[PDB]
Ligand binder design. Structure first.
Ligand SMILES: Nc1ncnc2c1ncn2[C@@H]1O[C@H](COP(=O)(O)OP(=O)(O)O)[C@@H](O)[C@H]1O
Ligand SMILES: [Mg+2]
Lengths: 303, 63
């Protein structure tokens, strides 16, 4: 008989799809304030999916940070659960990089510093995201220089201090860490591997690990077989390459942490260390990167 | 979004009004590449060449 969302919120257009949820814009009718409603039909969910839904709700409530989507409200009705977020209107960071045309290391460094601040906050709260990838990097608004917002805690897990455990196989293949692929016990460092993959893509516009044979893809990740080929990497500062190397370190105990990465000079001294040169080929590749993702997403839906 | 799907094919087609089989082969896994080649008709509009495929006709059939 609990219908507070139905009573007090009005739903509008869809803003994003999900495997088992939808995100629709909504308005708290009394206040006239806009939010994003992440809605799960709970009517025929399994007990495990109930647990995962409840987990995501707890973690979202727990995370308050300038670069993390902010939970405004949470409402449970008979056959629907609603997570109500502050609305972010800047879209995907990767689409905005392409739309604004010009991009340098200095821009990438400012972007990844924000991502690292979000991730550091998750880890300080005992949360491992486990799904750091381009679709989960939003921008607060269409304002030039708007903040990056980390989204989608659907795969996030709770850890206890620095203890590692086998928390399962989850994530997007191209971003998976070697320790997960080896079925080793893992924890927070899996997020920093994914940050290294994202940062690699921010610099040259294509992924460090890529193969249509997923078995070979996983071999390459587990071997840390990435490269900085010429010509595109010839103009990337040594310090940006060094930060990538420290994130894409196979041994998770030696991989750089979020706190250490925020002290990395390419980040902490961006103004004098990061190149200000526009990287036209990076934006060109990113444009194809985004098209490949959207098509590969639209295609299997049709198959 | 039907405006983003043809636009995405066009991006992989390097802005051409058609896409080639080897472009789908290069840019997509061998699965959805040979999927598309055997469901994409034939581009006979402006600028057509031997092998040109009609990704817009393949698309709007769906979205
Ligand atoms: N706070 C928000 N404001 C605006 N749009 C959002 C917000 N949260 C999510 N979305 C849109 O919905 C999409 C799916 O969000 P997400 O939480 O990842 O759902 P799922 O985990 O089910 O895919 C996002 O890519 C984004 O475009
Ligand atoms: Mg999800």
């Amino acid at each position: 008989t609990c219908t507070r969302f139905t009573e007090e919120y009005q739903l509008f257009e869809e803003l994003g799809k999900g495997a088992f949820s939808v995100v629709r814009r909504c308005v708290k009718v009394l206040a006239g304030q806009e939010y994003a409603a992440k809605i799960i039909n709970t009517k025929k969910l399994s007990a495990r999916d109930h647990q995962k839904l409840e987990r995501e709700a707890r973690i979202c409530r727990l995370l308050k940070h300038p670069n993390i989507v902010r939970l405004h409200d949470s409402i449970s009705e008979e056959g629907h659960h609603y997570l109500i977020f502050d609305l972010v209107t800047g879209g995907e960071l990767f689409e905005d990089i392409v739309a604004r045309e010009y991009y340098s290391e200095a821009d990438a460094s400012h972007c990844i510093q924000q991502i690292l601040e979000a991730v550091l906050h998750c880890h300080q709260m005992g949360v491992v995201h486990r799904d750091l990838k381009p679709e989960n990097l939003l921008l607060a608004s269409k304002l030039k220089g708007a903040a990056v917002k980390l989204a989608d805690f659907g795969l996030a897990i709770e850890v206890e201090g620095e203890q590692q455990a086998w928390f399962g196989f989850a994530g997007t293949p191209g971003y998976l860490s070697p320790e997960v692929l080896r079925k080793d016990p893992y924890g927070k460092p899996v997020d920093l591997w994914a940050c290294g993959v994202i940062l690699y893509i921010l610099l040259v516009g294509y992924p460090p690990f890529w193969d249509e044979d997923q078995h070979r893809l996983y071999q390459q990740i587990k071997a840390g077989a990435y490269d900085f080929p010429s010509p595109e990497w010839d103009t990337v500062t040594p310090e940006a390459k060094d930060l990538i190397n420290k994130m894409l370190t196979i041994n998770p105990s030696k991989r750089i942490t979020a706190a250490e990465a925020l002290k990395h000079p390419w980040i902490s001294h961006r103004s004098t260390v990061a190149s200000c040169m526009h990287r036209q080929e990076t934006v060109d590749c990113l444009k194809k990167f985004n098209a490949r993702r959207k098509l590969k997403g639209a295609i299997l839906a049709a198959m | 979004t039907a405006e983003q799907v043809i636009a995405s094919f066009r991006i992989l087609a390097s802005d051409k009004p058609y896409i080639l089989a080897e472009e789908l082969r290069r840019e997509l896994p061998p699965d959805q590449a040979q999927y598309c080649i055997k469901r994409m008709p034939a581009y006979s509009g402006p600028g057509s060449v031997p092998g040109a495929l009609d990704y817009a006709a393949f698309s709007s059939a769906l979205y």
